């Protein structure tokens, strides 16, 4: 079965591998994340709830006052998305929050409250995301990109190599929290374990143990293994265990139980260990010289006086041995030191550490944290407990605790957010073990250590910041507050929380201005995964490691779609099938592999557990039983590609498109072109400008439909049915009876967005894709949005391309374009400009907007209306006047020079209080008329639908066809119908219609007030006039045109069609590319794409030939079936007999322009399949044909390659780039060019160009262009007067920038002057 719109033009899909999992909703990463944030979560986890619950204690200091959160509910947005975008206001929901204030009696903490005050308070103003997963901040559609940052937890880095400049590897452990203070435990080059908290001065890390209420004895009991020594008559008989002898040297002669085991100079072999274990030796005599090298563990005092004979952790000498022997210390505890692995590291720190008590440790920590002031014991204790033992000032998220327990190999998954003594000692023990050799350091770039912070998590963090900021003020106010003297609304204000949220959403390191020029651009910018951002590595601070792709990126982050330049690999996109785990990690679908069967069950796997199993390659053949036909299959066990037997395999890739993202998946033959060319092609697809009439690509991937549907550019059908009425501005869908709810179903109305200004000044145009009466199913495409054709993403426009040099006009990378392309408007793109005029307050009276402008001609004022605003639809040109504004004593807005076009609409916003001019009244009246017309249209349409609902029910059980036509349709409650459930349904519809009639005038009045009320504007402005200019930029020499395979070039010449190379058929090639760019830049995919497009157009031409002549539908059906079969078995498998025999004609007419072919990313068309496809048509199997010269007329030898490759048109048009300037306004430093942009500017003759002129014998052109052309005011004036005089003579003078430098150096206090 196929969808009806798919029946219109069904895409020939290659790919032998059968798909098991349908492509997920590409915008899930944003929509699902925000649905988690704004949702009311009863569990109070993950949402505005956790944020309120985490910060709602409100405990007064000795005031018995408490305020608690009870519930909240986001209000309905004041303005709809379209209304907020046109007004410039944010799309936000008022945050109705219900709060309960309770006051307890004094000195009665356990007593009940004396009064309860519950009320709903408006705090904050939280913006919402549209159905397309994008915010609207200030009239701009702004999207928040998900941030990939190092997850909270513990990571044992190395910093191997450069440190200490001796090859000695250091080891450090960072306790990175979600919010709080970092805690790094580093090693001194002399193997001393230091602590570095918040990257402050290095400190002996043993001080933190003392700060955690631990003495030396406890520290050595935790971090070292006690060895018991017994004083005996036989020279202090020593107790040794078998395990401690492994890896030891010949310390002495081991003789126990009157038997010798190991002699002098004999290594302790495992055989010796086994035989002494069989003998079970426990006590071994040791020479007194050996104990000198041991270190005491615990303190010892004599039993007579109790004085300190020997403290803990110092070397033992002969005098110490004599003192402990004479005292009578029978039991002696010593540390087990093994320089091989179990080396001493805490002991060295304790030698370095001069602190012996917890108070001294706290004092030193305070000194190293807050120096310059005398610390206090209470102050130090408070600082430490607020720094590590306090939830408010320090917290690890559930992901942080999970990572902590993963790295520490703990058992529990969850735990307290704050740390503890056990956590610190466990981290130190693991760091010590890493130093010893057991265990391995972790990789920061691993996706198991870098989670993804979505928009919901960022918004929750900013909300928590706002809540704590207002909590500080509430606590401060409540200290002196009085009970029962105020409403629970004065202490909390929406101002700071709203300011924080608005600042985050509008101006942030991550609040990216959405590049809304392509559906692919929107779909890949909302899925963008940036490492940069708040709480993230910066570009300069980012290492080479982070930029560079990790083996664990497979299936999680696309390794092909990254922005080249300053941030390469830092803003990498997310692969098509990857989804974010509930802890922020990146999962990946993976088919479970059973005993030998590749089972269809899809198990999402994170990066940490991917290594544990072995992953099979997607390009592994199966025998339809899940059995690899392939006894050894290539696999990815631990990030290493290696052949594995079938029985070894534990998991398989979900499909062949897993690794690539949506931006890189749409490139056909991605398996052929080079990775750099693939990267550039994926990047350039995001910046193609929509053509006027977008058309499907002849060769594609099959994800274009998925990208177009998933993105919000098109108008998908939420409910199926039939198209009752279709219009270029609206589409009405009559929902089917089996797809509509019993109540309030009616029919669906879709208001397609007409020509609207976009973020990159392009047209967001939606054209209907259906006619009247066309059946439509659920989730179907109805309107072809920008760069969309028949529900398929149509970025550019495919055309004939011949690969051959042509007189140098395609010299190295330039593109040659025929006159035929320009003639048929293939690349004419509508650009909507936003020329906004503002009337601010001015001294000595304000400025008017009337048409009275002095020192101007009547011709310029002819376009403007009587009130000084350009007539809608007027075709203005460069330098023309749009709206007449004169300042009090000629500041009217004018079209910028060069740009032209016709005004599409002029919207005016006027603040309340100032009377609106004639044009504003006319526009407001037309807006009211349009709103009333739309409301009446929906009134009549929904009334017709509801009557059809009623009439259909009234065909049985009291049917009166004649009686219905008699009485007017307004009243039907008097009709006689059986007292059954049908009568109840009619009564329900009648009551609903009555309530709707009551609400109709209310909402109409609300709309009238919305269009009447003065729109909020910036302070000190009268009214703002926005004029939208539609520029139709045709293709021109210099316009940057680029295909999908990384081949980019500027159009050199628009060559007349008569000069184009034509084949024997006479059809001239539309574009003549350069073959020389194929071998070096290995974009060989474009050659495969060219051949497949040639085959597709051959099929289309055969269909056209058998369609232009009146042929039987049987011939069309058999040819279409032959085309869709195409030899080698494919997943497509479309049968033409199941069609209705008249939609076959529609299909053939839709394939007249070319056969649509889908080439999946990594299992697309092979060379044999393409050759067979060429053989299907009249075209040769070689793919290249003889072409005759356009001018000479004789065929080119060595027949050239032609085909219809899908090449885009990037938005880097030459029209934008022209920046010529002679003289203009100057800067502060008096550098004349004034930072060239829209502002009329000269290009920075930078330091490199100055060096270049210095290398030449240039001292006059350089001098003129560094002095008289740039900043010398007298010099500039004299040069201008001289050139207009005709004498090109330079009056040198001196650059004013040097005078500025002299003044700045003098202002420092350094006299710098010149000698005369």
């Amino acid at each position: 079965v196929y969808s009806y719109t798919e029946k219109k033009r069904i895409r020939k899909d290659f790919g032998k591998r059968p798909q098991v999992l349908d492509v997920p909703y590409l915008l899930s990463i944003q929509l699902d994340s925000f649905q988690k944030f704004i949702e009311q979560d009863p569990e109070g986890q993950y949402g505005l709830e956790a944020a309120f619950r985490s910060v709602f204690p409100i405990q007064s200091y000795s005031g018995n006052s408490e305020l608690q959160y009870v519930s909240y509910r986001l209000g309905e947005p004041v303005f709809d998305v379209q209304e907020c975008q046109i007004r410039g206001v944010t799309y936000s929901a008022p945050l109705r929050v219900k709060l309960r204030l309770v006051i307890y009696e004094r000195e009665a903490p356990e007593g009940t409250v004396k009064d309860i005050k519950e009320q709903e308070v408006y705090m904050g103003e939280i913006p919402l995301m549209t159905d397309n997963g994008t915010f609207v901040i200030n009239g701009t559609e702004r999207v928040i990109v998900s941030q990939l940052h190092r997850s909270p937890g513990v990571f044992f880095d190395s910093d191997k190599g450069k440190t200490h400049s001796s090859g000695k590897v250091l080891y450090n452990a960072r306790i990175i929290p979600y919010r709080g203070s970092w805690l790094d435990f580093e090693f001194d080059p002399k193997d001393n374990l230091f602590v570095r908290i918040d990257r402050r001065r290095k400190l002996p890390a043993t001080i933190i143990l003392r700060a955690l209420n631990y003495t030396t004895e406890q520290i050595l009991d935790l971090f070292f293994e006690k060895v018991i020594f017994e004083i005996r008559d036989n020279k202090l008989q020593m107790e040794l265990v078998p395990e401690r002898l492994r890896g030891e040297t010949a310390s002495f002669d081991i003789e126990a139980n009157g038997k010798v085991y190991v002699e002098k100079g004999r290594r302790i072999t495992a055989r010796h260990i086994r035989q002494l274990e069989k003998d079970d030796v426990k006590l071994i005599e040791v020479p007194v010289e050996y104990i000198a090298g041991k270190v005491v563990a615990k303190d010892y005092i004599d039993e007579s006086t109790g004085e300190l004979i020997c403290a803990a952790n110092m070397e033992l000498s002969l005098d110490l041995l004599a003192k402990l022997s004479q005292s009578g210390h029978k039991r002696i505890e010593t540390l087990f030191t093994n320089d091989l692995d179990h080396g001493p590291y805490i002991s060295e720190t304790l030698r370095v550490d001069p602190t012996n008590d917890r108070l001294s440790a706290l004092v030193e920590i305070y000194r190293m944290m807050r120096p310059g002031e005398p610390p206090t014991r209470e102050a130090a204790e408070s600082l430490f407990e607020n720094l590590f033992f306090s939830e408010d000032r320090y917290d690890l998220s559930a992901v942080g605790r999970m990572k902590f327990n993963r790295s520490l190999l703990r058992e529990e998954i969850e735990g307290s957010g704050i740390l503890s003594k056990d956590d610190i000692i466990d981290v130190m023990k693991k760091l010590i073990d890493i130093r010893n050799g057991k265990g391995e350091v972790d990789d920061i770039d691993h996706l198991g250590n870098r989670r993804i912070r979505s928009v919901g998590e960022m918004a929750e963090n900013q909300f928590r910041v706002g809540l704590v900021r207002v909590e500080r003020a509430v606590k401060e106010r409540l200290s002196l507050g009085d009970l029962d003297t105020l409403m629970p609304q004065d202490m909390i204000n929406a101002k700071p929380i709203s300011a924080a949220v608005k600042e985050f959403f509008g101006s942030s390191q991550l609040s990216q201005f959405m590049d809304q020029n392509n559906p692919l651009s929107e779909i890949t910018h909302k899925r963008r995964i940036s490492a940069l951002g708040p709480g993230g590595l910066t570009r300069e601070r980012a290492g080479f490691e982070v930029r560079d792709v990790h083996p664990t990126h497979y299936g999680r982050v696309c390794p092909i779609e990254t922005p080249e330049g300053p941030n390469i690999g830092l803003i990498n996109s997310l692969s098509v099938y990857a989804q974010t785990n509930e802890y922020g990690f990146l999962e990946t679908p993976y088919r479970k592999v059973t005993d030998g069967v590749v089972t269809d069950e899809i198990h999402y796997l994170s990066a940490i557990e991917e290594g544990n199993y072995v992953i099979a390659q997607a390009n592994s053949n199966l025998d339809e039983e899940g059995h690899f036909v392939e006894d050894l299959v290539t696999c990815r066990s631990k990030g290493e590609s290696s052949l594995f037997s079938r029985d070894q395999v534990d998991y398989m890739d979900v499909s062949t498109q897993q690794v690539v993202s949506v931006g890189a998946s749409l490139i056909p033959f991605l398996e052929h072109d080079d990775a750099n060319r693939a990267l550039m092609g994926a990047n350039m697809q995001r910046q193609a400008v929509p053509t006027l009439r977008a058309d499907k690509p002849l060769v594609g991937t099959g994800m274009e439909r998925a990208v177009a549907v998933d993105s919000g550019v098109t108008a998908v059908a939420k409910r199926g049915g039939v198209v009752q009425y279709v219009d270029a501005s609206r589409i009405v869908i009559k929902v089917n009876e089996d797809e509509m709810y019993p109540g309030e179903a009616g029919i669906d109305i879709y208001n397609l967005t007409k020509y609207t200004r976009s973020n990159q000044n392009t047209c967001i145009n939606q054209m209907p894709c259906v006619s009247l009466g066309e059946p439509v199913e659920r989730g179907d495409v109805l309107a072809d949005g920008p760069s969309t054709d028949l529900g398929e993403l149509a970025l550019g426009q495919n055309m004939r391309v011949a690969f051959m040099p042509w007189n140098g006009y395609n010299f190295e990378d330039s593109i040659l374009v025929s006159e035929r392309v320009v003639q048929e408007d293939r690349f004419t793109t509508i650009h909507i400009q936003e020329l906004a005029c503002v009337s601010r307050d001015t001294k000595l009276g304000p400025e008017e907007i009337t048409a009275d402008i002095p020192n101007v001609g009547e011709a310029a004022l002819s376009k403007l209306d009587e009130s000084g605003i350009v007539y809608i639809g007027a075709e203005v040109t460069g330098g023309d006047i749009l709206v007449g504004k004169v300042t009090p004593k000629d500041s009217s807005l004018r079209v910028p020079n060069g740009v032209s076009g016709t005004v599409i609409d002029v919207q005016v916003f006027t603040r309340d209080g100032v009377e609106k001019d004639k044009r504003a009244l006319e526009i407001e009246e037309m807006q009211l008329k349009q709103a009333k017309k739309d409301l009446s249209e929906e009134l009549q349409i929904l009334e017709a639908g509801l009557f059809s609902r009623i009439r259909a029910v009234l065909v049985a059980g009291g049917v009166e066809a004649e009686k219905l036509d008699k009485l007017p349709r307004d009243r039907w409650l008097e009709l006689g119908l059986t007292d059954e459930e049908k009568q109840n349904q009619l009564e329900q519809l009648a009551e609903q219609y009555d309530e709707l009639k009551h609400e109709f005038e209310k909402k109409l009045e609300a709309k009238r007030r919305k269009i009447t009320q003065g729109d909020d504007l910036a302070p000190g402005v009268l009214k703002i006039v926005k004029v939208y200019l539609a520029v139709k930029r045709r293709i021109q020499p210099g316009d940057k045109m680029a295909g999908r395979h990384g081949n980019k070039g500027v159009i050199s010449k628009i060559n007349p069609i008569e000069d184009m190379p034509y084949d024997e058929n006479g059809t001239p090639v539309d574009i003549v590319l350069n073959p020389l760019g194929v071998p070096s830049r290995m974009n060989i995919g474009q050659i495969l794409e060219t051949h497949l497009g040639m085959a597709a157009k051959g099929i289309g031409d055969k269909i056209n030939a058998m369609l232009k002549q009146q042929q039987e539908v049987a011939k069309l059906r058999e040819f279409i079936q032959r085309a869709y079969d195409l030899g080698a078995d494919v997943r497509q498998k479309v049968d033409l007999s199941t069609f209705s025999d008249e939609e076959v004609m529609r299909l053939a007419e839709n394939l007249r322009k070319g056969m649509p072919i889908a080439t999946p990313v990594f299992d697309g068309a092979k060379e044999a399949e393409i050759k067979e496809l060429l053989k299907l048509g009249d075209l040769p199997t070689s793919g290249q044909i003889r072409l005759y010269d356009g001018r000479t007329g004789e065929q080119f030898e060595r027949p050239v390659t032609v085909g219809y490759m899908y090449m885009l048109k990037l938005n880097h048009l030459v029209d934008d780039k022209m920046h010529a300037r002679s003289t203009g306004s100057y800067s502060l430093v008096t550098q004349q060019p004034l930072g060239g942009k829209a502002q009329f500017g000269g290009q920075r003759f930078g330091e490199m160009e100055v060096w270049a002129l210095e290398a030449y014998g240039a001292a006059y052109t350089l001098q003129e262009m560094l002095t008289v052309k740039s900043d010398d005011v007298n010099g500039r004036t004299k040069m201008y007067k001289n050139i207009v005089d005709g004498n090109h003579q330079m009056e040198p003078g001196m650059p004013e920038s040097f005078n500025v430098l002299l003044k700045e150096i003098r202002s420092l206090g350094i006299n710098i002057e010149l000698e005369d």
């Binding site: 690999g569 990815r636 690969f803 140098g808 650059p1295």
Partner: protein
């Protein structure tokens, strides 16, 4: 915004400080930018330029001419006339662009030739047209590359731009004497296709009166472009004291090589156009033309050779296709042998005969051997497989395949860049640089496995990040090099210093990396060189070593030549001309004054972007 606020020292230091932002290099007026266009019809002394850009840049000149001719009484009326773009304004504009050079300027001006002068040719459009030859000098693409145009104002500025900065005056790069305007990518391919031969081509065998008859036969279509035919040529040589003598002979050649003969100037011999004429051959041709004919004949010859190369590359139709890249028939058996060998090595490791390290080394070695074998098989299939007759039984010739012609000619491509298309792509390394044990066996003509493409994108991301870091490192190095320099200019003409450095061809254990001919060329000796005959003044003490002297040195078999080094110069606050040597951009001694510190710094720093980041003694030959 919680950011450090700029102080009185933050605006005197750093990139954004007053020095490097407003004094060292400052924005200028009379400047415009646009994307660039090829426009092969131009000559390198001129460039295309849009009408709007010429109107805006030359506004003061247009105002002055309007005032002089009385079209507008006042600047104000003339400015209104320029806004109206009245037809009279365009005619005035054509007068101020007759001989007014403009300085084409690409943004990353790495070396001296980054900015060059051009006579603007008014074109309708909005894209600057840059001559194809100077694109290599500019390192400029046609992929959205934009370059600024600056208008010299004063007579001194325009005059020195014409005399020095013109592309006609910049033929040899300052880094080395080799030409910089050499046919680079497409014209070289056209010449290479032109100068070849089929062993059996249409119109092969008949004798031709001259190049005119060769053109007549080719254009009429009755003789193939490259067919081995004897032609009669009037080869001109200047073996006399500047006089050109004529030598007429029947040199066996092809039609295509005879076509180029009318392009080359008189002085050049025919032995330079009788080869396949790749990139290196054309570079040597242009260098010989510059060293023999001079500058103007070299410019005219370069323009004509560009024209013919483009025209006959268009006529060639040197396309690219799937059948143009051939898979070796032995590639499958080489892959099978490599798989068998790695299986044997793994089996040996499993038993324990070979541990991990030696197993890894063995696998890497055998995979490299298989890669070399498949590369050789690919080259044999790509240059030897071609079978074509000679009106007889059987013969084998050098291939005319599209990719082989586009790679062997040096037009664009290399050995690895052609291996990655038909042969095994090779062992591809991980981010850390350690080689993946199992290579990317599949090539680009065939598909790539998902893991194979993952390793490929590992390498590609490594290369892209390396380039991104390396361009910044090279820019910093260029800045340091320029600034340790820029006080060193040629202040004197000679110092009479006998000191110097003994120039000797460099040997690093292998063959001669650089012969003494190309190492001492253009430098003035310090003491008289002598041949095996003692007390022989083969070259006097203070004579510049031009091409003739170096050629004489090779045939006299000199070993070490003491030469005057700039280090040994005793001149204060500069160096003398003799101690420096040839300008490396003009065929004469360095001019007294020219700044050579900045030239040297730019020459050193320009290839920084092209750099990278990471027994027994046996006699070789008889002697």
């Amino acid at each position: 915004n919680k950011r450090p606020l700029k102080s009185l020292a933050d605006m005197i230091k750093g990139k954004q400080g007053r020095f490097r932002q407003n004094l060292l290099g400052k924005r200028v007026d009379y400047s415009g930018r646009s994307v660039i266009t090829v426009g092969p019809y131009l000559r390198l002394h001129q460039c295309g330029l849009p009408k709007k850009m010429a109107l805006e840049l030359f506004k003061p000149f247009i105002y002055g001419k309007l005032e002089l001719r009385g079209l507008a009484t006042t600047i104000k009326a003339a400015k209104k006339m320029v806004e109206r773009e009245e037809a009279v304004v365009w005619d005035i504009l054509d007068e101020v662009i007759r001989e007014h050079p403009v300085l084409l300027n690409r943004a990353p001006t790495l070396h001296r030739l980054g900015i060059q002068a051009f006579e603007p040719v008014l074109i309708e459009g909005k894209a600057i047209q840059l001559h194809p030859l100077v694109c290599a000098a500019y390192n400029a693409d046609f992929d959205g590359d934009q370059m600024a145009v600056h208008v010299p104002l004063t007579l001194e500025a325009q005059l020195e731009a014409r005399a020095l900065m013109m592309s006609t005056n910049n033929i040899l790069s300052p880094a080395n004497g080799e030409p910089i305007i050499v046919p680079s990518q497409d014209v070289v391919l056209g010449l290479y296709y032109m100068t070849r031969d089929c062993v059996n081509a249409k119109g092969e065998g008949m004798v031709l009166t001259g190049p005119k008859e060769a053109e007549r036969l080719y254009r009429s279509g009755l003789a193939s472009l490259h067919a081995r035919v004897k032609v009669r040529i009037t080869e001109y040589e200047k073996d006399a004291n500047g006089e050109l003598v004529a030598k007429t002979s029947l040199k066996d050649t092809t039609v295509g090589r005879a076509i180029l003969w009318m392009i080359v100037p008189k002085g050049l011999p025919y032995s330079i156009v009788n080869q396949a004429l790749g990139k290196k051959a054309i570079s040597k041709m242009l260098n010989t033309c510059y060293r023999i004919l001079g500058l103007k004949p070299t410019v005219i010859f370069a323009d004509q050779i560009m024209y013919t190369g483009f025209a006959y590359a268009a006529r060639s139709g040197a396309s690219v296709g799937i059948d143009d890249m051939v898979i070796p028939e032995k590639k499958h058996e080489i892959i099978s042998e490599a798989e068998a060998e790695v299986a044997e090595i793994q089996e040996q490791f499993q038993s324990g005969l070979v541990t991990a390290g030696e197993r890894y080394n063995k696998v890497i070695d055998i995979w490299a051997a298989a890669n070399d074998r498949v590369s050789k098989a690919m080259m044999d299939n790509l240059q030897t497989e071609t079978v074509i007759n000679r009106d007889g039984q059987e013969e084998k010739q050098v291939s005319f395949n599209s990719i082989y012609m586009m790679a062997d000619s040096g037009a664009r491509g290399s050995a690895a860049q052609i291996r990655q298309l038909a042969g095994m792509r090779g062992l591809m390394a991980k981010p850390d640089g350690s080689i993946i044990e199992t290579p990317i066996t599949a090539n680009f003509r065939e598909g790539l496995n998902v893991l194979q493409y993952f390793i490929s994108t590992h390498g590609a991301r490594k290369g892209l990040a390396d380039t991104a870091l390396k361009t910044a490192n090279s820019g910093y190095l260029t800045r340091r090099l320029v600034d340790v320099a820029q006080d060193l200019v040629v202040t004197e003409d000679d110092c009479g210093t006998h000191e110097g450095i003994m120039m000797t061809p460099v040997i690093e254990g292998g063959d001669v990396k650089e012969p003494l001919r190309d190492r001492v060329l253009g430098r003035v000796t310090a003491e008289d060189v002598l041949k095996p005959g003692t007390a022989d003044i083969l070259v006097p003490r203070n004579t510049l070593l031009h091409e003739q002297w170096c050629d004489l040195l090779e045939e006299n078999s000199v070993d070490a030549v003491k030469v005057r080094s700039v280090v040994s110069c005793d001149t204060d606050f500069g160096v003398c001309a003799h101690c420096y040597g040839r300008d490396l951009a003009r065929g004469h001694i360095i001019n007294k004054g020219e700044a050579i510190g900045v030239i040297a710094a730019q020459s050193i720093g320009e290839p920084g972007t092209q750099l990278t980041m990471r027994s027994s003694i046996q006699v070789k030959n008889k002697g």
